[PDB]
């Protein structure tokens, strides 16, 4: 929410995670072996509670879409990394010993357009491609409304250019794992403002139009 820090060098994180990444900066132990983390497989098998420290696999906390990364190529430091996602339905928390991560449930709504042919069963809140009217779809977005585009062929300059002068300002635009999420600014000066993008399904160009 009202924080700009996401690094974990008592790091406590309370933010709306939309495919946002957690940097667990931890030593190799070959230099200082006194330092340790109590959960070995942190961000994969992590305590659900704070006092009743019990190991639970990351599939059984309340995250919906996720991937956990351990990459050890850096000789100075090694990190265990997890991606969080907007699809979570509740405010879960977990503790790596202290690393307090809070995954706040997203208060506003979610709009998903799957122009790609795939079963993104995790978030079935949609328009599909059938709603596209003459191969153009016009999705209005309430304040803070989270729009997601599933099209793999996003080409370039998605949300960068807005037709008809003024461009619809987006606070954050995420392109993670071929998935394009639009965050509505939640405050707009004038309703008459447009943002655009391209997609290529069946070699036809399907384009989405977002307005307040």
């Amino acid at each position, epitope marked *: 929410s009202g924080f700009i820090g996401y690094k974990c060098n008592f790091c406590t994180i309370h933010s709306y995670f939309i495919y946002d990444k957690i940097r667990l900066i931890i030593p190799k132990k070959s230099s200082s072996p006194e330092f340790k983390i109590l959960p070995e497989k942190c961000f994969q098998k992590v305590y659900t509670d704070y006092e009743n420290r019990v190991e639970t696999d990351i599939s059984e906390l309340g995250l919906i879409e996720y991937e956990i990364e351990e990459n050890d190529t850096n000789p100075n430091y090694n990190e265990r990394t997890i991606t969080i996602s907007p699809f979570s339905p509740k405010d879960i928390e977990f503790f790596c010993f202290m690393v307090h991560v809070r995954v706040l449930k997203y208060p506003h709504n979610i709009l998903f357009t799957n122009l790609t042919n795939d079963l993104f069963t995790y978030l079935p809140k949609t328009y599909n491609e059938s709603n596209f009217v003459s191969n153009v779809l*016009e999705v209005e977005l309430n304040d803070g409304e989270l729009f997601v585009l599933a099209c793999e062929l996003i080409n370039k300059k998605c949300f960068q250019e807005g037709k008809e002068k003024a461009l619809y300002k987006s606070n954050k635009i995420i392109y993670h794992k071929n998935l394009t999420i639009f965050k509505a600014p939640f405050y707009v000066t004038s309703k008459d403002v447009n943002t655009e993008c391209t997609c290529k399904f069946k*070699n036809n160009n399907y*384009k989405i139009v977002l307005k307040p």
Partner: antibody
Amino acid sequence: QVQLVQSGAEVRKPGASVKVSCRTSGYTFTDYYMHWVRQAPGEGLEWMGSINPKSGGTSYAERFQGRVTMTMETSVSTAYLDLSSLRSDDTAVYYCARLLYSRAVYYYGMDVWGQGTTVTV
Amino acid sequence: YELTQPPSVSVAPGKTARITCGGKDLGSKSVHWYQQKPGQAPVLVIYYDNIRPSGIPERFSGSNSGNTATLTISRVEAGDEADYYCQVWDSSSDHYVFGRGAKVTV
């Protein structure tokens, strides 16, 4: 099964009035914008004017503003172009075309065009 | 305003043809491309500057970038001998401005 049929070829003397009809058989009227485009012989196309389907539209080209009066009766679902004060620059082959009515108009194009009415002045 | 399409385009069979639709701030304004045969009605080939219609051969394509819009009709073959006009709806004047045209010859 779906097509746009216009009036037959007509010859009018200069200074007279010519009425061109565009009836929508396959497609229900007022769903799409109605546009009029004329092509002078051996010259590029020129869009005359557009009428909004939901409410009456006064959008006409500056060159054809004075002498073009486009009316929509919607009883027979036919588009009527009333043209008068013809001259050497007012003879062309006329084409009626439709684009989907939306709150913003820049998207969508003229997918279907009329048969074509030849007017000689 | 006015669209400064070239007066002509010269192309060979089995090649890419580029028709540039030139206009001031034409990236922010949609172009619609219409194929004009000598007697047949304008066949829409690109609308909203990159979309392919339901019924059309796949080779037709086009994009708009910056102040120029290019109709990339790749693999030019027989039957493409036509005039391609780009149409722009002018929002400020509320009147569509129609391109001068550019004949494509094989």
